[PDB]
Amino acid sequence: MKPEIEQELSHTLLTELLAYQFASPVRWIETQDVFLKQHNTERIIEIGPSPTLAGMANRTIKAKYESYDAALSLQRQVLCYSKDAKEIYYKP
């Protein structure tokens, strides 16, 4: 793929995504599947004033990926900028 055509298609797709996402229903289930199972992400970072997404990611991995994490030996570390800033910046 040429860089110019790739940039064209990426711009069009990004614009369509941002346009249609605020009216289409948010599919956070597949996003959680992506960043928990497909990518096997041992570290989750959430940035915000409060941990609204960190908590629900925590209970998602608890309800769905507990045995998965056990068997694969995945030590998930869910971190929020509000509370776990020391872990974010590696300042124990």
């Binding site: 298609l9 941002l18 249609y20 009216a23 229903p25 948010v26 609204t52 997404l53």
Partner: protein
């Protein structure tokens, strides 16, 4: 077998031939040392023939190492091409057992792609790298050769070496110097796989002695990129005065970055025969990207220094990509980190191909005057990088990256060494770790080095609306300079263009805020407010219908605070997230291959923070614009109250049987039966959280329907099992009709009552992520197209790393992905792109 053979080859000539049998072909090879015997003077009856001494030692070392015919007629500035070698499990096994690496990634297992250690890079490239010190123009005593430092550097996006890889090596000599201690030689060996670089191996060698051949010395220094900002025309004039500055543009304000490399040539120790400094002059764009706007080109003959580097150091600031955090963290500095040098150096010599006799032969070490058959410095490096790969990583081969190491001391066989490493800093998401090894018996550093290991696979998720709080991000605003920059740029744009301070709103959260339109700046701000339009389907109703040419002010109204307002909440939250992420970037905690996503507004914040698709000013402008657009999207009452809202429900709290499918079915059947908007907007954590939006009548209807299910203990799936789908519809329609007849009584606006499973999301009146806003989405698409510049959209920051809120799959530029987007949007532009895709590619 014979290791020394002494004879009188001719009268007054004693050959001391040092034999070596640990060779490549197993044939013995001699190192002659001719000695004039002088009967005339008995004080010094032996005179060493220094003649061809170094050439003879080089021939012997060449027979030992190389494979290649003896030919020292190699240009020092040329590139050495190594032999093509295919990686084999047997070779990795031998190498790992030699250096003591027990990592799982390098042991053959079923159903696993056995990998090879990065220390195998020196084995692959030993021929090319060590061929660099042989040429005549780099002359010295190879027996006095000292390996000063060695290091590896993986290329970004390049996977580690693995079994079956057919790999070639290229080697170049970066610098040859004459220092008081001896002659320095710098070699860089690039590892090529399938025609692409896989990594680089840096090596430094010292030829101890005195050398005056300055004509053969050179240096290629990659000068660090220096940042300079122009706050006045004086800087512009000073730079334009420089003959080496090739820019051709106006740079008032602006910030340049000089990615420069300097090539040197020496005539003496302190005077440079020539200097050639050239570089890319990049300019920082509003999107934080750096684009080459010019070049540095400086050439000089006899010179005493580098004026380009001198001026840049004095006037600019070094970027310093490596970032050291507050306090070094011990990283298993202790007894368990002890590494023991091998009893013999034969296995490492055999596997690596480095047959230097000072490691294996006692006679050659004694001649070289070094203390015994010391272990390979490369063995030490690999053995301690095994400790790094074991402890700093988790036997994870993805973490093997740039590993610098310096052989400061010396290690004997059967030597116990107390390695110590601590996480000290960070570089572009990789964890910089000092590695220091000191022998236990004497406690002197023998190895000192740096290691770069990737953080665990990370995704930077970004928060959506509802979490806003007063004074959010302030502590970081006071502490971190980059957070100051983000917040100040945003705030100053806000005051200049809309006439209010987002920092003031966040800090104070004023109940009322009056924007005044006096003076020319007031007229410009009023013009911005007037030009703000809500386009829909094509209607063009204005957001601020009560602002016109004759109005002197406009007042924002909130019940308790304006920070809760959509137009000020969204920029404030986007900005706190952007500032936190930018401070994190300044600290270098962003792995290159991160993932990222975000919840509603968090998506825009994430894209700005990671992909940098927009500048801070444009980001805040668009989020403010769409916040006001969402404010005017819903017809409000006389007191700014609409008939729309959001409620977060829990099927598990309704009952264990009630699932996402049951909640959905109830939602669509309520909407269809009552002819009112009601949909599930957010599909959060399964069976625990689901946000729904619609007409407030329908939201209350859903509340009471789920309450009825909670109390009566009736399961939709059970009904589906025990009667036909039509009868299930009829039952749920009976429930919905009862509740709808009740909802008719509830007058507008309806204050929702917290149910068993449903909780109202207070402070929200827009039903967003619903079919309601599809009318505004298309004009919002046009707005996004104009406000997101095409050149600023970098796919490399998105492909396989961006999980869009719409599709919830890794972002990809493929026909399948575009087809999914059409499946979710019904967009004809996507179909034009899909149909033309074959021509596009």
């Amino acid at each position: 077998l014979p290791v020394v053979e002494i004879e009188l080859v001719k009268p007054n000539t004693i050959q001391l031939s040092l034999i070596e049998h640990r060779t490549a072909d197993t044939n013995p090879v001699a190192l002659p040392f001719l000695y004039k015997y002088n009967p005339a003077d008995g004080f010094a009856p032996i005179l060493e023939i220094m003649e061809d001494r170094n050439e003879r030692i080089k021939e012997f070392y060449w027979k030992l190492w190389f494979s290649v015919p003896y030919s020292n007629d190699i240009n020092v500035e040329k590139a050495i091409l190594g032999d093509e070698i295919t990686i084999s499990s047997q070779t990795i096994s031998e190498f790992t057992h030699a250096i003591g690496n027990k990592c799982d990634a390098f042991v053959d297992r079923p159903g696993k792609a056995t990998l090879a250690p990065m220390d195998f890079a020196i084995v692959i490239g030993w021929k090319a790298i060590i061929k660099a010190i042989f040429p005549k123009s780099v002359d010295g005593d190879l027996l006095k050769l000292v390996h000063l430092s060695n290091g590896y550097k993986m290329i970004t996006g390049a996977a580690p070496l693995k079994k079956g890889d057919v790999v070639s090596t290229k080697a170049e000599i970066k610098a040859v110097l004459n220092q008081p201690s001896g002659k320095l030689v710098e070699v860089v060996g690039t590892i090529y796989r399938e025609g692409k670089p896989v990594m680089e191996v840096t090596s430094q060698f010292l030829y101890r002695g005195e050398y005056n051949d300055y004509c053969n010395t050179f240096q290629k220094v990659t000068e660090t990129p220096v940042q300079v900002a122009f706050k006045s025309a004086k800087d512009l004039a000073v730079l334009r005065s420089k003959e080496w500055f090739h820019l051709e543009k106006d740079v008032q304000f602006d910030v340049l970055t000089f990615r420069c490399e300097s090539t040197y040539k020496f005539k003496s120790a302190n005077v440079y025969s020539s200097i050639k400094t050239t570089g890319q002059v990049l300019l920082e764009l509003p999107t934080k990207e750096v684009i080459q706007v010019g070049s540095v080109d400086y050439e000089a003959g006899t010179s005493y220094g580098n004026p380009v580097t001198d001026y840049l150091s004095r006037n600019g600031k070094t970027i310093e990509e490596s970032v050291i955090f507050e306090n070094a963290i011990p990283l298993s500095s202790g007894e368990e980190l002890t590494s023991k040098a091998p009893g013999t150096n034969e296995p490492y010599a055999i596997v690596s191909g480095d047959y230097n006799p000072i490691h294996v032969s006692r006679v050659f070490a004694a001649y070289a005057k070094l203390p015994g058959t010391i272990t390979h410095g490369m063995y030490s490096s690999a053995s301690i990088r095994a400790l790094v790969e074991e402890w700093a990583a988790n036997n994870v081969a993805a973490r093997v990256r740039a590993f610098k190491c310096d052989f400061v001391g010396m290690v004997l066989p059967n030597d116990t060494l107390q390695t110590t490493m601590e996480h000290v800093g960070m570089i572009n998401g990789r964890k910089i770790i000092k590695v220091e090894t000191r022998n236990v018996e004497t406690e002197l550093p023998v190895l000192i080095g740096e290691a770069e290991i990737e953080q665990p696979t990370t995704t930077y998720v970004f928060t959506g609306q509802g979490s806003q709080e007063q004074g959010m991000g302030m502590e970081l605003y006071n502490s971190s300079e980059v957070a100051r920059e983000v917040w100040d740029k945003a705030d100053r744009h806000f005051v200049n263009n809309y006439g209010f301070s987002i920092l003031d709103i966040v800090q104070n959260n004023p109940n009322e805020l009056t924007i005044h339109f006096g003076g020319a700046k007031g007229r410009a701000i009023r013009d911005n407010y007037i030009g703000m339009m809500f386009e829909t389907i094509l209607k063009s109703e204005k957001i601020f219908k009560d602002i016109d040419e004759t109005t002197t002010s406009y007042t924002f109204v909130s019940p308790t605070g304006l920070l809760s307002a959509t137009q000020f909440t969204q920029p404030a939250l986007t900005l706190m997230e952007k500032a936190a992420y930018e401070d994190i970037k300044s600290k270098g905690l962003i792995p290159s291959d991160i993932m990222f996503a975000g919840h509603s507004l968090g998506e825009y914040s994430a894209l700005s923070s990671l992909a940098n698709v927009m500048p801070i000013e444009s980001l805040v402008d668009v989020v403010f614009y769409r916040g006001m657009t969402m404010q005017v999207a819903v017809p409000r009452d006389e007191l700014g109250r609409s008939n729309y809202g959001m409620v977060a429900v829990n099927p598990s709290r309704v009952s264990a049987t009630f699932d996402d499918s049951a909640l959905r079915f109830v939602v669509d059947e309520v909407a269809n039966k009552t002819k009112w908007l009601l949909e599930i907007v957010n599909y959060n954590v399964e069976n625990q959280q689901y946000v729904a939006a619609g007409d407030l009548r329908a939201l209350d209807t859903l509340t009471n329907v789920l309450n009825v299910l909670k109390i009566n203990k009736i399961d939709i799936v059970k009904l589906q099992e025990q009667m036909s789908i039509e009868k299930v519809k009829e039952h749920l329609y009976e429930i919905v009709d009862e509740v709808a007849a009740k909802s008719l009584a509830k007058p507008q606006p309806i204050d929702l009552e917290r149910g068993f499973a449903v909780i109202p999301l207070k402070g929200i009146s827009v039903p967003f992520h619903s079919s309601y806003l599809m009318s505004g989405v298309k004009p919002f698409q046009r707005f996004l197209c104009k406000k997101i510049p095409k050149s600023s959209v970098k796919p490399q920051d998105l492909i396989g790393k961006y999980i869009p809120n719409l599709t919830a799959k890794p972002f990809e530029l493929t026909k399948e992905y575009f087809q999914s987007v059409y499946d979710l949007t019904k967009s004809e532009k996507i179909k034009s792109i899909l149909d033309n895709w074959e021509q596009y590619e």
